[PDB]
Curated annotation (Swiss-Prot):
PANTHER family assigned to the protein according to its UniProt record, in alphabetical order: CYTOCHROME P450 YJIB-RELATED, P450, PUTATIVE (EUROFUNG)-RELATED
Gene Ontology BP annotations: macrolide biosynthetic process
Residue numbers binding heme: 341
Catalytic function, reaction form: narbomycin + 2 reduced [2Fe-2S]-[ferredoxin] + O2 + 2 H(+) = pikromycin + 2 oxidized [2Fe-2S]-[ferredoxin] + H2O; narbomycin + 2 reduced [2Fe-2S]-[ferredoxin] + O2 + 2 H(+) = neopikromycin + 2 oxidized [2Fe-2S]-[ferredoxin] + H2O; narbomycin + 4 reduced [2Fe-2S]-[ferredoxin] + 2 O2 + 4 H(+) = novapikromycin + 4 oxidized [2Fe-2S]-[ferredoxin] + 2 H2O; 10-deoxymethymycin + 2 reduced [2Fe-2S]-[ferredoxin] + O2 + 2 H(+) = methymycin + 2 oxidized [2Fe-2S]-[ferredoxin] + H2O
PROSITE patterns hit by this protein: CYTOCHROME_P450
Key word Aminoacyl-tRNA synthetase present: no
Binding site for substrate: 81, 174-178, 225-233
Function comment: Catalyzes the hydroxylation of narbomycin to give rise to pikromycin, and of 10-deoxymethymycin (YC-17) to give rise to methymycin and neomethymycin during macrolide antibiotic biosynthesis. In addition, produces low amounts of neopicromycin, novapikromycin and novamethymycin. Requires the participation of a ferredoxin and a ferredoxin reductase for the transfer of electrons from NADPH to the monooxygenase.
Enzyme class: oxidoreductase
Gene Ontology molecular function, alphabetical: heme binding; iron ion binding; monooxygenase activity; oxidoreductase activity, acting on paired donors, with incorporation or reduction of molecular oxygen
Listed InterPro entries: Cyt_P450 (IPR001128), Cyt_P450_B (IPR002397), Cyt_P450_CS (IPR017972), Cyt_P450_sf (IPR036396)
Protein name: Cytochrome P450 monooxygenase PikC
Disruption phenotype: Abolishes the production of methymycin, neomethymycin and pikromycin and leads to the accumulation of their precursors.
Chain's gene name: pikC
Length: 393
């Protein structure tokens, strides 16, 4: 039983060697996450892609040996933590809001938010800033908050709750944060009743009130929570991890600067090279599963390591090479199967507009600290930085 906790920041900063080491012996391994969670890891691209879409692996806690806590049980009635038919029904409720055509209409506004954030950033007399605080965090929370209808003065509370979910001081902090967020969402939800709002939450509230059978109040709350949190810590880290990748690879940054039509390709390679999701969300086998000899008992917690999949040579030649011109087709940065990220088009839009704005307005943009000085968060499911110092002329 490998204990990831005893590996420290060394493993947090560069977990790849550890994963590949495990991939060499087999596809599934038992480990102890930093928080003390005894879980299973699935490494290797082929096995990883298969498991993500293998119906034998449920996301419904009723099939999990580990029980939900009281505060967690208040938010699990959402699509990411359910199997069909519930999943089918819940996702249908919002699929239409996230199509590429629907998201494209948001381009003008996303552009506004980015230009404003960059305007403010370039106001620094020293030509220095923390990209995490100036853009990576502000952009994502602003967009999703406007789509759902979260008042501006309430958006700060989320960075706090979100942090307590990722790198909580103690187990209790996370639980308290959930209870608070849970209480806030219920109040936000109730405040929309009778107000004729046209934001997504208001529509959902109307749907639930009209027929509690199509969307129960537990699910309304669950839906509001998943849409706000599943795309927060992820888009934030994509922007930051992606810019770090570019800034730590001068040659690639130059090629993109020279030819901006490589942008879309650059963004995909960022997802594949330094995607924010190191490990997918909890899966629980509904029956004992045998992965090439290793048997994962029913009920155990399983984590598909997307990061290791992205470094499998057979799938991505010269894995450790960050190449924006590389063939990325097949990466699992957004998952695979029925739970495939519903916010992918919106994630891609924000990332594309943010990367272009920095390259075209920050002359001689450069990393303002050495790669080795950067600090990464411990949590195995999330790949993200504590801060990203940058500078320009
Ligand atoms: C670059 C940013 C993003 C990445 C890399 C990402 C990644 C993922 C991944 C890996 C999954 C499935 C994981 C699993 O199967 O356990 C997923 C699911 C999901 N994502 Fe994203 N996501 C991002 C942005 C977004 C955005 C912007 C939203 C919100 C608008 C969002 C909403 C969701 C939801 C609600 C699900 C559940 C889908 C379902 O269960 O049917 N994601 N995302
Ligand atoms: C969709 C990929 C990202 O994951 C999340 O957003 C997960 C689902 C979210 O997980 C947990 O949030 C709690 C508030 C409720 C809990 N459930 C038991 C009711 C749910 O599993 C994040 C808060 C967890 C991780 C740490 C994260 O920040 C994002 C990870 C992405 C992989």
């Amino acid at each position: 039983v490998l204990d990831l906790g005893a590996l420290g920041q060394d493993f947090a900063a560069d977990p790849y060697p550890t994963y590949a080491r495990l991939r060499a012996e087999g596809p599934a391994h038992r480990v102890r996450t930093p928080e003390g969670d005894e879980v299973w890891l699935v490494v290797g691209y082929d096995r990883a892609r298969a498991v993500l879409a293998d119906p034998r692996f449920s996301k419904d806690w009723r099939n999990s040996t580990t029980p939900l806590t009281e505060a967690e049980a208040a938010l699990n009635h959402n699509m990411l933590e359910s199997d069909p038919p519930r999943h089918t029904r819940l996702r249908k409720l919002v699929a239409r809001e996230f199509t590429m055509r629907r998201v494209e209409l948001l381009r003008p506004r996303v552009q506004e938010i980015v230009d404003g954030l960059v305007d403010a950033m370039l106001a620094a007399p020293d030509g220095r800033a923390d990209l995490m605080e100036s853009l990576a965090w502000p952009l994502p929370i602003t967009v999703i908050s406007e789509l759902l209808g979260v008042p501006e003065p309430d958006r700060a509370a989320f960075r706090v709750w979100t942090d307590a979910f990722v790198f909580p001081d103690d187990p209790a902090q996370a639980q308290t944060a959930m209870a608070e967020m849970s209480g806030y969402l219920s109040r936000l939800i109730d405040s929309k009743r009778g107000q004729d709002g046209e934001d997504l939450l208001s529509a959902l509230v109307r749907t639930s009130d009209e027929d509690g059978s199509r969307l129960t109040s537990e699910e309304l709350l669950g839906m509001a929570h998943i849409l706000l949190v599943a795309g927060h810590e992820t888009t934030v880290n994509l922007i930051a991890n992606g810019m770090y990748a570019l800034l730590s690879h001068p040659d690639q940054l130059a090629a993109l600067r020279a030819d901006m039509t490589l942008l879309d390709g650059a963004v995909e390679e960022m997802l594949r090279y330094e995607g924010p999701v190191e490990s997918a969300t909890y899966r629980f086998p509904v029956e004992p599963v045998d992965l090439d000899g290793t048997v994962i008992p029913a009920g155990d917690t399983v984590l598909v390591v997307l990061a290791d999949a992205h470094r499998t040579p057979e799938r991505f030649p010269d894995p450790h090479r960050f190449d924006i011109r590389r063939d990325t087709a097949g990466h699992l940065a957004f998952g695979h199967g029925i739970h495939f990220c519903i916010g992918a088009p919106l994630a891609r839009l924000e990332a594309r507009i943010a990367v272009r704005a920095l390259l075209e307005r920050c002359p001689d943009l450069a990393l303002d600290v050495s790669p080795g000085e950067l600090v990464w968060y411990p949590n195995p499911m999330i790949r993200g930085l504590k801060a990203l110092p940058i500078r320009w002329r």
